[PDB]
Design an enzyme around this catalytic site. Structure first.
Site, short mmCIF file in Angstrom:
data_model
loop_
_atom_site.label_atom_id
_atom_site.label_comp_id
_atom_site.label_asym_id
_atom_site.label_seq_id
_atom_site.Cartn_x
_atom_site.Cartn_y
_atom_site.Cartn_z
N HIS A 74 0.87 -0.99 -0.12
CA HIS A 74 -0.12 -0.19 0.08
C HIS A 74 0.72 1.18 -0.08
CE1 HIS A 74 -3.17 -2.81 1.91
NE2 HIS A 74 -3.65 -2.58 0.48
N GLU B 87 1.77 3.89 2.95
CA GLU B 87 2.45 3.38 4.12
C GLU B 87 3.81 3.44 4.23
OE1 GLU B 87 0.37 -0.44 4.64
OE2 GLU B 87 -1.48 0.41 4.26
N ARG C 291 -3.35 4.77 -2.30
CA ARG C 291 -3.13 3.38 -1.52
C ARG C 291 -2.90 2.53 -2.70
NH1 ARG C 291 -5.24 0.19 2.31
NH2 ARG C 291 -6.36 -1.86 1.56
N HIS D 235 2.68 -3.41 6.97
CA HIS D 235 1.78 -2.31 6.77
C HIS D 235 1.74 -1.00 7.67
CE1 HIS D 235 -0.94 -4.24 3.64
NE2 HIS D 235 -0.22 -5.19 4.06
N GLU E 211 0.95 -4.22 11.44
CA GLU E 211 0.36 -2.96 11.25
C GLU E 211 1.30 -2.09 12.17
OE1 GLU E 211 -1.44 -1.52 9.35
OE2 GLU E 211 -2.70 -3.03 8.32
ZN LIG Z 1 -1.90 -1.29 4.03
#
Ligand SMILES: [Zn+2]
Ligand SMILES: *[C@@H]1O[C@H](CO)[C@@H](O)[C@H](O)[C@H]1NC(C)=O
Ligand SMILES: *[C@@H]1O[C@H](CO)[C@@H](O)[C@H](O)[C@H]1NC(C)=O
Ligand SMILES: *[C@@H]1O[C@H](CO)[C@@H](O)[C@H](O)[C@H]1NC(C)=O
Lengths: 53, 307
Positions: free
Chosen positions: B66, B69, B124, B194, B268
């Site tokens: 993405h 990020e 994104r 991420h 994340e």
């Molecule tokens: Zn992501």
């Protein structure tokens, strides 16, 4: 070309990271077969935000 | 080098970094071509392997699926640098490399990542055109062949979670999936980096069902979260995506588990929402140092299962 007007997104679903954000359908003129390009833009308190991580 | 790991780098600097790090550590690192993006930017991974006679199992890590990020590619570079700078003197890294090879994909969504530097910081998706160019981009983490488009993904090309025209329809996804599929019997652990949210996510996103080894996954995950918090007090939550984040389908994490890779995690990284995707560069070093603890904890656990 008739560029579609900007408008609220239709059935936009959730914005999980910013649950109360607003989704807008935004189009701009562009050099392609139909003359425009569109995307969904999410905003909260005057700022664009991301919804998914 | 004078390459700083404490700032964000645009793609051209990352291309040069891969080339320089590969030559400087040529005895233990090679750079391999996976494919090209829609815009014909080459996608590479770095393979870290201490040569020996032992058969190697594989740790896969990718960052930047993405585009916005930015902390994720920063961590992939940090990870590489830590392994390479310490692979001779550090007993624990030397241990891991006796039986594991590390494959690291620093930026997967290169077109989107370039776009976040040039045009739109919060982009994104990929940059492939759809509907005759009237919209752009597929969410590459909805494009893998894992309950494709069943939930938590959109068929509307304008949506940020657009799953693509079909499973594995984008060139970035094809490049990753065909490679992973060819190595799947040797891959012990699949890590997808991420931001943001401070979570360690197990499968699945597309069902609240748990995988057959879910207890093992959250024990390893919770120990990694604990090792991470010990550094600066950063709190991480561990659990399945569907339980603690939101439903999704077509993620690479779920696809990897589905093809039989026993450990498959989405990390994340920082933060929890104060800055979101635009994490200040002052937080790169502490984020990477604490995340490094988590990742080495996982790798220690995976290793201990076999050697
Ligand atoms: Zn992501
Ligand atoms: C849109 O693209 C398709 C190619 O897939 C083409 O067949 C069609 O004629 C295009 N439409 C216009 C109005 O250019
Ligand atoms: C998706 O995966 C299934 C295998 O489980 C396969 O039969 C189907 O052909 C796959 N589709 C693509 C496009 O890979
Ligand atoms: C969840 O597991 C049950 C068996 O426990 C199975 O019948 C069902 O198909 C699974 N759901 C999904 C979405 O795979």
């Amino acid at each position: 070309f008739h560029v579609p007007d900007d408008r609220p997104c239709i059935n936009p679903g959730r914005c999980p990271l910013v649950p109360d954000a607003t989704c807008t359908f935004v189009c701009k003129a562009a050099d392609n077969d139909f003359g425009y390009e569109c995307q969904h833009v999410w905003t909260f308190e005057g700022q664009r935000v991301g919804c998914y991580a | 080098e004078t390459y700083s790991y404490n700032i964000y780098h645009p793609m051209g600097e990352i291309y040069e970094w891969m080339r320089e790090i590969s030559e400087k550590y040529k005895e233990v690192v090679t750079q391999h071509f996976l494919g090209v993006t829609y815009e014909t930017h080459p996608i590479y991974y770095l393979k870290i392997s201490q040569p020996s006679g032992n058969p190697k199992k594989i740790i896969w890590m990718d960052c930047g699926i993405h585009a916005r990020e930015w902390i994720a590619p920063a961590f992939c570079q940090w990870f590489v640098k830590e392994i390479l700078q310490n692979h001779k003197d550090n007993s624990r890294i030397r241990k891991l490399l006796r039986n594991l090879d590390f494959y690291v994909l620093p930026v997967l969504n290169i077109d989107g990542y370039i776009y976040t530097w040039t045009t739109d910081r919060l982009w994104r998706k990929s940059r492939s055109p759809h509907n005759n160019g009237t919209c752009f981009g597929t969410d590459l983490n909805r494009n893998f062949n894992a309950s494709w488009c069943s939930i938590g993904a959109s068929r509307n090309c304008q949506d940020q979670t657009f799953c693509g025209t079909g499973p594995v329809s984008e060139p970035e996804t094809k490049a990753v999936a065909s490679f992973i599929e060819s190595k799947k019997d040797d891959i012990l652990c699949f890590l997808t980096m991420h931001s943001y949210g401070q979570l360690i996510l197990t499968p699945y996103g597309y069902t609240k069902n748990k995988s057959s080894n879910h207890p093992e996954m959250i024990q390893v995950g919770q120990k990694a979260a604990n090792a991470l918090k010990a550094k600066y007090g950063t709190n991480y939550r561990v659990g399945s995506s569907a339980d603690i984040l939101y439903a999704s389908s077509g993620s690479s994490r779920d696809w990897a588990r589905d093809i039989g890779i026993p450990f498959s995690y989405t990390f994340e990284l920082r933060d929890s929402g104060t800055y979101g995707f635009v994490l200040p560069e002052a937080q790169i070093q502490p984020t990477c140092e604490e995340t490094m603890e988590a990742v080495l904890s996982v790798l220690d656990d995976v290793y201990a299962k076999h050697w």
